[PDB]
Amino acid sequence: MIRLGYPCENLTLGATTNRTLRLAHLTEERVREKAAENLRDLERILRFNADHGFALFRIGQHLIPFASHPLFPYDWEGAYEEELARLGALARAFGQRLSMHPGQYVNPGSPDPEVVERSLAELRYSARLLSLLGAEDGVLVLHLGGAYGEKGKALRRFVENLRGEEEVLRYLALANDERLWNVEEVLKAAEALGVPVVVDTLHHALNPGRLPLEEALRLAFPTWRGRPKVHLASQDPKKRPGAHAFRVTREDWERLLSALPGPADVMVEAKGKEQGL
Numbered sequence: 001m002i003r004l005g006y007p008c009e010n011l012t013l014g015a016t017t018n019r020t021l022r023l024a025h026l027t028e029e030r031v032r033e034k035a036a037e038n039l040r041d042l043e044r045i046l047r048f049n050a051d052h053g054f055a056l057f058r059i060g061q062h063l064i065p066f067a068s069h070p071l072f073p074y075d076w077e078g079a080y081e082e083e084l085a086r087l088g089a090l091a092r093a094f095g096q097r098l099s100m101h102p103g104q105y106v107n108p109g110s111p112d113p114e115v116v117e118r119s120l121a122e123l124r125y126s127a128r129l130l131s132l133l134g135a136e137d138g139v140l141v142l143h144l145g146g147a148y149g150e151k152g153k154a155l156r157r158f159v160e161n162l163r164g165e166e167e168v169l170r171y172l173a174l175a176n177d178e179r180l181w182n183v184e185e186v187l188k189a190a191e192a193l194g195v196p197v198v199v200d201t202l203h204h205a206l207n208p209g210r211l212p213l214e215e216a217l218r219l220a221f222p223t224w225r226g227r228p229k230v231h232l233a234s235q236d237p238k239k240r241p242g243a244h245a246f247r248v249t250r251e252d253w254e255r256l257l258s259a260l261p262g263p264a265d266v267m268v269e270a271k272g273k274e275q276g277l
């Protein structure tokens with residue numbers, strides 16, 4: 001019924017795919033060694049996953065640090081395509097489903113054309129990565145971002161700025177957030193782009209609209225060609241709304257298992273990573 005994943009890094013291993021460096025500082029030799037370390041860790045994680053009933057993994061945005069920066073000092077595709085092909089072969093052989101989640105500052109709906117172009121650059125880098133790994137069912141998950149002023153107009157820019165981007169749209173899926181965009185609203189944008197919807201259970205609890213969870217899932221699921229993807233997290237009882245708990249509580253698991261209208265791939269977003277169950 002369920003396949004599990006966790007994002008970016010692994011705690012028992014001390015493996016992470018998300019090492020970066022300060023911009024100061026972005027020179028070929030510095031980035032090469034950070035990428036190398038990241039890529040080595042991607043393998044340790046895939047291999048670990050194969051032996052631990054994990055089928056899903058989110059690669060960190062920083063896999064190749066600053067890979068979409070206008071001053072990235074070399075051809076990272078040329079540099080890493082062979083090793084990325086190799087890591088992708090392992091993933092497939094291991095039945096692993098890879099995904100990526102661009103940062104808070106990735107917003108193609110921004111009024112600022114300079115923030116749009118840099119956002120599309122991060123997205124294009126991310127999608128190319130998935131292609132270099134040969135991840136057919138790879139997903140690229142995106143929140144709809146700030147309603148700068150107000151939404152609707154922000155939504156329209158978002159759709160226009162993404163509709164040309166073929167390679168990104170091959171992987172793109174959209175997620176609901178705790179603030180501006182509920183599932184209903186996201187379904188509308190996704191349908192406009194012809195991409196699927198990732199329901200984020202904690203965000204949905206925080207910002208439900210008028211759909212109950214079971215209702216949000218039952219609408220979101222048909223949007224997937226393959227098997228639908230879900231985000232599961234629990235509210236940290238001491239921290240601000242939306243902040244992720246170290247471990248998904250048993251109640252939150254059951255609320256999700258009850259609401260499922262079919263099989264799903266669940267990405268567990270807990271601070272505890274592979275221990276977050």
Ligand SMILES: [Mn+2]
Pocket residue numbers: 202203233242243244
């Ligand atoms: Mn969240």
